[PDB]
Amino acid sequence: AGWNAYIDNLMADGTCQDAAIVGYKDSPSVWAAVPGKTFVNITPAEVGILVGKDRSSFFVNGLTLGGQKCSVIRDSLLQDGEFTMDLRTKSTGGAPTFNITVTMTAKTLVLLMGKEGVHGGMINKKCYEMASHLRRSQY
Template identity: 35%
Template sequence: WQDCITLFLQTGMCCDAAIITNSPPWLLASYPEGNLFQLTQEEIQILLAREGREKLFLQGITLAGTKCLLIRDNLYTEGNNTMDLRTKGQSRGSQAVTVVQIESVYLVVMGQKGTEGGPLNLKAFEMAGYIKEAIH
């Protein structure tokens, strides 16, 4: 999984990435110089819960201690399986975050400052396709 993280960061669009799952060990791989390696079990469980997802729009979500606004939630929509968030309340400006489901694991990527959510989502979805092909 660490190779996937390295590959994704080489696109130049991302500044951080992690691969998570909804059961222990929760965090499978992450960028050691980023923040997502600090994702907690509780944050991951809230992010990936299938029940009560509508409250994420109201309350937002915390990832590695950073508050995020939920922009679009298609994580459990067949054929899409992505989720778009944006960090908030940071003096250095907000950043786009995309989560994409790849079978039983999830890729979480944070865009560089200035990277919009749409292109980040497309790149994450594209990378998920490559990873799916590599698995099979």
């Protein structure tokens, strides 16, 4: 309810192409996402891996978000005051790859995907700031 307003903000400057707010407690589900893209299709199983105990194997095997294959660049998801994970999509046949940052709040995972050529640091900072805003409001 009203959660798509946060998506609108994340999508406002035009450098990002996808975004989602996913609750990870109890039964995971997408609270808001960009219709027609990738994050909207995120499954509870994919959410279980992001917040999982094994935080090594995915550096070798990669992971999927909405069925899209990704490689993990750095993981500080469960690190207090840091809360981020930087990823990059894995493409095939000349398709462009995009940078993604996932930030954990008290109840959600804020995922953001940049457009082609957009630096991961910019994506990381934007995702982190939205996550902190939510965190301050107890989400």
